[PDB]
Amino acid sequence: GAQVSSQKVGAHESTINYTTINYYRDSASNAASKQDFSQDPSKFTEPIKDVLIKTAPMLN
Amino acid sequence: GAQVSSQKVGAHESTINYTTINYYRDSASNAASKQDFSQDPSKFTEPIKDVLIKTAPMLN
Amino acid sequence: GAQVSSQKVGAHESTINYTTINYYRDSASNAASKQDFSQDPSKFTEPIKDVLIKTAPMLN
Amino acid sequence: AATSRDALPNTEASGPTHSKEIPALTAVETGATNPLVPSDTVQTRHVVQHRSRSESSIESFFARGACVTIMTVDNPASTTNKDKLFAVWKITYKDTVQLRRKLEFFTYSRFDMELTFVVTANFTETNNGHALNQVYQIMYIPPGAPVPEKWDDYTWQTSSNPSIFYTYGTAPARISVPYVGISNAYSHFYDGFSKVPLKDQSAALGDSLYGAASLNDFGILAVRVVNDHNPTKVTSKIRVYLKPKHIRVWCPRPPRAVAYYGPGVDYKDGTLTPLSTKDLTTY
Amino acid sequence: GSSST
Amino acid sequence: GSSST
Amino acid sequence: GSSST
Amino acid sequence: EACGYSDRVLQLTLGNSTITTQEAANSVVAYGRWPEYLRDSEANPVDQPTEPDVAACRFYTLDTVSWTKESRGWWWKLPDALRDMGLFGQNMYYHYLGRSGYTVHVQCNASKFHQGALGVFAVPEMCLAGDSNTTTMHTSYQNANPGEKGGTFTGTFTPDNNQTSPARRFCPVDYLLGNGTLLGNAFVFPHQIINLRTNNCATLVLPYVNSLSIDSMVKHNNWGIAILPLAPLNFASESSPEIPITLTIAPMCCEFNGLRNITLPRLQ
Amino acid sequence: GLPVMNTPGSNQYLTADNFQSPCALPEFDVTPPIDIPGEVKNMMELAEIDTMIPFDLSATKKNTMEMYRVRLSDKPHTDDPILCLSLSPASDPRLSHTMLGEILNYYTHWAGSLKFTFLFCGSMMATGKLLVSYAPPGADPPKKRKEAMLGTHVIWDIGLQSSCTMVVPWISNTTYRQTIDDSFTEGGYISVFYQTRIVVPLSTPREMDILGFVSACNDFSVRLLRDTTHIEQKA
Amino acid sequence: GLPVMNTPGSNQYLTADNFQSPCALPEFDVTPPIDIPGEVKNMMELAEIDTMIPFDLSATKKNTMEMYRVRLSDKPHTDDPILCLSLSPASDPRLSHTMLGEILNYYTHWAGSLKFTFLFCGSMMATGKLLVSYAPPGADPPKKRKEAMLGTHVIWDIGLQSSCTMVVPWISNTTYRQTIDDSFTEGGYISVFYQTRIVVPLSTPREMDILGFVSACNDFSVRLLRDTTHIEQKA
Amino acid sequence: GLPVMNTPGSNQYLTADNFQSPCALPEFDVTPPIDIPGEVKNMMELAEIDTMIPFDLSATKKNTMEMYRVRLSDKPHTDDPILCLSLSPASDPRLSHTMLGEILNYYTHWAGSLKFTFLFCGSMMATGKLLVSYAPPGADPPKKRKEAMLGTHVIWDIGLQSSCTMVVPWISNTTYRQTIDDSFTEGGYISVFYQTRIVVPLSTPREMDILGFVSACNDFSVRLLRDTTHIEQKA
Numbered sequence A, B, C: 001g002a003q004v005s006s007q008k009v010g011a012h013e014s015t016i017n018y019t020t021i022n023y024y025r026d027s028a029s030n031a032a033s034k035q036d037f038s039q040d041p042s043k044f045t046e047p048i049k050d051v052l053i054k055t056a057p058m059l060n
Numbered sequence D: 001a002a003t004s005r006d007a008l009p010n011t012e013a014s015g016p017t018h019s020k021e022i023p024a025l026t027a028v029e030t031g032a033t034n035p036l037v038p039s040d041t042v043q044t045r046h047v048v049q050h051r052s053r054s055e056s057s058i059e060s061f062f063a064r065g066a067c068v069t070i071m072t073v074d075n076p077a078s079t080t081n082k083d084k085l086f087a088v089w090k091i092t093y094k095d096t097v098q099l100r101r102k103l104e105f106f107t108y109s110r111f112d113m114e115l116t117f118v119v120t121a122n123f124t125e126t127n128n129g130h131a132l133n134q135v136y137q138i139m140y141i142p143p144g145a146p147v148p149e150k151w152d153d154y155t156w157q158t159s160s161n162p163s164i165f166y167t168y169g170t171a172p173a174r175i176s177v178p179y180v181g182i183s184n185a186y187s188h189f190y191d192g193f194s195k196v197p198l199k200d201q202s203a204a205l206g207d208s209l210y211g212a213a214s215l216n217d218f219g220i221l222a223v224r225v226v227n228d229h230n231p232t233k234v235t236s237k238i239r240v241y242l243k244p245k246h247i248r249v250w251c252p253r254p255p256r257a258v259a260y261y262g263p264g265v266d267y268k269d270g271t272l273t274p275l276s277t278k279d280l281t282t283y
Numbered sequence E, F, G: 001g002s003s004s005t
Numbered sequence H: 001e002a003c004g005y006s007d008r009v010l011q012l013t014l015g016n017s018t019i020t021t022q023e024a025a026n027s028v029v030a031y032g033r034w035p036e037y038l039r040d041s042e043a044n045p046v047d048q049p050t051e052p053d054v055a056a057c058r059f060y061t062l063d064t065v066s067w068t069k070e071s072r073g074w075w076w077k078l079p080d081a082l083r084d085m086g087l088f089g090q091n092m093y094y095h096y097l098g099r100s101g102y103t104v105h106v107q108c109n110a111s112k113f114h115q116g117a118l119g120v121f122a123v124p125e126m127c128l129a130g131d132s133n134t135t136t137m138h139t140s141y142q143n144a145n146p147g148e149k150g151g152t153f154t155g156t157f158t159p160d161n162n163q164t165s166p167a168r169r170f171c172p173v174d175y176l177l178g179n180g181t182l183l184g185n186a187f188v189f190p191h192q193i194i195n196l197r198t199n200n201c202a203t204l205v206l207p208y209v210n211s212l213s214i215d216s217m218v219k220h221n222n223w224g225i226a227i228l229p230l231a232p233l234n235f236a237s238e239s240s241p242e243i244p245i246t247l248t249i250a251p252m253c254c255e256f257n258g259l260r261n262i263t264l265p266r267l268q
Numbered sequence I, J, K: 001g002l003p004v005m006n007t008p009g010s011n012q013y014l015t016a017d018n019f020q021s022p023c024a025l026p027e028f029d030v031t032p033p034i035d036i037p038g039e040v041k042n043m044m045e046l047a048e049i050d051t052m053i054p055f056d057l058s059a060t061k062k063n064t065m066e067m068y069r070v071r072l073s074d075k076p077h078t079d080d081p082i083l084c085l086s087l088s089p090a091s092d093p094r095l096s097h098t099m100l101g102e103i104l105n106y107y108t109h110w111a112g113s114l115k116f117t118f119l120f121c122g123s124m125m126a127t128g129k130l131l132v133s134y135a136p137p138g139a140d141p142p143k144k145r146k147e148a149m150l151g152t153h154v155i156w157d158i159g160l161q162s163s164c165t166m167v168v169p170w171i172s173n174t175t176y177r178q179t180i181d182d183s184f185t186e187g188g189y190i191s192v193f194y195q196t197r198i199v200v201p202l203s204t205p206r207e208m209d210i211l212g213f214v215s216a217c218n219d220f221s222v223r224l225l226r227d228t229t230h231i232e233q234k235a
């Protein structure tokens, strides 16, 4: 049941990896993976009904 | 001898699993798996000799 | 995710090896491998534009 | 597929321009922010961008234990007139300010909760007596379960409530808790009441606090020294640290700008001037 | 070796 | 056994 | 699994 | 479009009602989410919902307010502002539970010689601060819920010192967005600006937002509408200009659960 | 030795933990199970069994057999309630001590549909139609048939099938309700009315009892285990 | 037992650690998520949203609505600044309380391009050309159009497109700047000037406001998490 | 829990250990390297670079520029030494502060071949032959050319190639020598003599300096890391 993931190696001395095994039945007990996703800001930065083309007039 | 089971993941950050190894000869020493079964309540809720059809009269 | 490397065995009693597993996501947490490289001293000992041939006159 | 530790976009080299394309001109009335990058208004070089947003992901922003309360308990001489102090705390992140402000950048959240307990003790009277090592009981009492009236009454039996028996001087205690809300997310803000005032009912009877939902939202932690009374009194403090693991957040908000004043959004007179003097044309 | 549930 | 990310 | 150097 | 179509000229039709505009600044869909009915996978009360459709999902116009050089701002809560609007209000008070989205259309025209800018903000869970420094969280249901008349912002916090009979109302200070956070940051909420030289309206389409799929509309407001003068009204060289502001709001995809006798609230 | 680093939580005793530990009686010859009738696998099975409600907790009827008996009579039709009850299954005093109520008091949260079944215990010659009602919360609690009619209800005709069931469907704002009196998670109102009236011929008792029962439906669940207040040990 | 050797760090509590720990509520029935609108995945998304700058923090205008309003008028052309601002997004008093400024105060380091958008709020009849400037650090801060012209700038023509944006490109010696006033990691100078002048016809207000907004570009990032000074709890 | 048994060494802090430990700044955005010129991979690279010897540590010349200058003159031939030096690269006062000497003072043991290069700094018109000598230890240290001749040596003819190198070959009983004065691991004797004499024409300086340099050969190594005595912090 071992999970093997890679580290993003910052300062250097191949891919360096690390190992994780969950010891508990409840996912609440698990550490955080930090393997997170990003998304586009659009729902906040461009919430407009008609798609904005930045080279065009915002108002036409 | 490792047992690998899945967690029911509640709050989220594939299947997340966890590992279990028994360290002792006596099953009494083992932790609880919590991998339990359910059953129908009928032996308590419908202990009647003739099967009950709920749309029908209970007495005929 | 286990890394298996050989030891340079100094005093003796095959290749003797040792095992390493990284426990953390951040490479900063890792121990030092000590698996390091050497380089030629030339950038400091022979920084001259024209390659030096030691049997030849340094000045011609 | 884009991850938090991925590098941000490269700057592309761009040259001079003379066209009907007008990126610089916009109209903020629409509610949108102009998506510009340097190559839209100046000449740029090609840069291979290595920086990432890894440390500002929601998880990484919150990935720290914050102190949310300090509980006080003691174990006095048996001869004292005052009762042995056990502590009772209603669980919340609103007794302190720092984690509260961070969570309040958002309206709603889901997370698993990690609680860590740091325990310290000291002597109080200028005595010369000793005390043997203390064991503490941290009992979680969910809304409905009997709250302790005495340091030693029947409730400390804990047949069903979770308890931690912590030994003094060992590693700080720690447990995890799942997302336990009765809603699909925790509400950092609830614009409403828990009761509707009816006309046919008295005002008192229909009344309730603004912005409060379940009176006993998450229950109580009750802490005691399990050791019996000792000739020399020792006082202890339990510091509780909360870390939100596996977190999700919704609906961004402007951060708290004036000092907190209670569990609601209320503010006190005299604290309403955060900003300092600075002249319009002074750098 | 390993069992899997 | 082992997962790999 | 295992790397070997 | 080469056939005349414009970002500034819109027509909105819901039920038996139509809004036209010739000076819009596009329109906003909050968080990019259009209103929707509750999905079976997210459903919670099991009884057949009531879905009044055109009877309630139509444009309701609230009482017109007036913008002057001394105006500090206005606020409304949803669904509270609509509690007395035709069959929407009826369906609301007859059921324990209800959910709804909204099209909010703020109207304010002037002339090419007037100037001023209104920030129109839709805030999820718009909790406002109270008037007291002796008691927190003490704004009464009646004062929290003005119905269609709404409330206003003030430039000055002024504490209710009558401790015998406390006012129990909000004291929402404008630069603090009435909730202790700076107004300049309110733009992270779904918004538009009515800047008189550019546009004469704001249109915000709001999804139902909550930490629940459905809730008590009578106990809880989901959205707050806050209108504040970001740049003050001004005209020619008149000392006392006035232009009206009208709100027209339409419920969208509203459904109700838990039918019983009608709720008769204590509103005064 | 293997290099190890002790983490927080080390050496604590969490009463809810789930760890292995050494056996004090190694190689003990355990006695095998036999197939005893009545095995239970989940506490909600017990909650699905009908148990009888102590409806009439008046000062003289409480803690006596009489508390289970709701008295009806052949009086002229009224729109006034036979009984009124809050849907607070763990905390309303009439529900909290039923088997459902008892199990709910070991948990913090409940959710799902419930059902009330009434048993007519008058004579065969007695007839009657009653209205059983559930009003979800938020309005004036029904005190007259007129209001109760507008909510979830069953009009019960008395006859050979002695009993009638009204299902209180899960209708809630929150995904789970609290097992205590709480306005935010309030459940609303159960009430019973005369639809017509009880009618009897001559030579017949003019007053009789109905009995009521509550049980959980198959969609019912509880969570967050806790200690009950229904037992204590002072000293 | 397995031979083990306790290492340094053993038994400490690092508040930034990331370890497993036992669950106090085993088998708890978690409530599922629903698709709530407005989910945020990274704090920099919030930094990319335009929020309004409190430019005029004069003693009488600060902490009032007036601080957001930069007053312009139709006066004859001058080469003197409408406003002057330091590019210190987390520490200059005019930027530090914007949403960008606020998020930066939870981090020690920032990097990337920024953008300033100005909104003209005068009447339709009012015209004007303004010069918006960014001077990277190292010279005399621009106090006259003559100097500001020589740096990064946008000449804004007022008209139907009400607003104009100047991008402050990432131009720095260090790979990241400090979120405090620091000469080594100084960012330079933002300033605005009259290019021609505001011109109005008769019957028109001769004075008006512009509003300014700041936001981060897609190449913007922060690091080294820290506590802010923007909130406290004395006692 | 997994049965474990704490071994000796448990909980100690060895300053030379090599263990993992938790990161105080998780997910920190590290700044990438750039290709800075001059990277060093091993301290012996520095030892292979020629640095200049402070040969003349007389009371008046020490700690001044003069200590690096060995004065020669055109005097008649003598068999007497120009200089005498012990092969104790980390401890002889003339060698211990060279870059080689300095690095050796962070180690307990050294081994390998070394080389001394002398630079003639007189005028072009000056000629001369010198004898540079290395006598391995065990006999009378050479004080006359007669003895020095019998050991390892280079006869240097002065001319266009300004400099001359003598290699001190690794000649030792032990596999490594100590970095302190030690008779068991003594290295022997470096010395320089006039082979003929310095001859100059008229109108020419009759006295001049030679400069000397020491560096390690490619077969040179050090071991057992230690603190130096070449720096301290009293109070």
Ligand SMILES: CCCCCCCCCCCCC/C=C\[C@H](O)[C@H](N)CO
Pocket: D091, D092, D093, D113, D115, D138, D139, D140, D162, D163, D164, D175, D177, D180, D181, D185, D186, D187, D188, D217, D218, J024
């Ligand atoms: C033995 C120790 C057990 C500790 C058990 C703690 C269980 C209770 C968890 C409380 C969750 C608090 C979540 C934070 C607050 C909420 O966000 C808001 N007030 C909205 O609901």
Ligand SMILES: *C(=O)CCCCCCCCCCCCC
Pocket: A001, A002, A021, A022, A023, A024, B002, B004, B019, B020, B021, E002, F001, F002
């Ligand atoms: C998957 O996990 C199979 C491989 C097992 C690797 C060794 C497990 C190390 C010890 C885990 C003990 C169990 C935790 C309760």
Ligand SMILES: *C(=O)CCCCCCCCCCCCC
Pocket: B001, B002, B021, B022, B023, B024, E001, E002
């Ligand atoms: C099945 O268990 C084979 C795989 C073994 C995995 C590693 C075991 C980890 C240590 C267990 C020690 C023995 C317990 C007494």
Ligand SMILES: *C(=O)CCCCCCCCCCCCC
Pocket: A002, A004, A019, A020, A021, C001, C002, C021, C022, C023, C024, F002, G001, G002
């Ligand atoms: C690669 O690592 C797969 C093999 C796993 C070997 C056993 C791992 C031993 C325990 C590591 C625990 C996880 C560290 C957080």
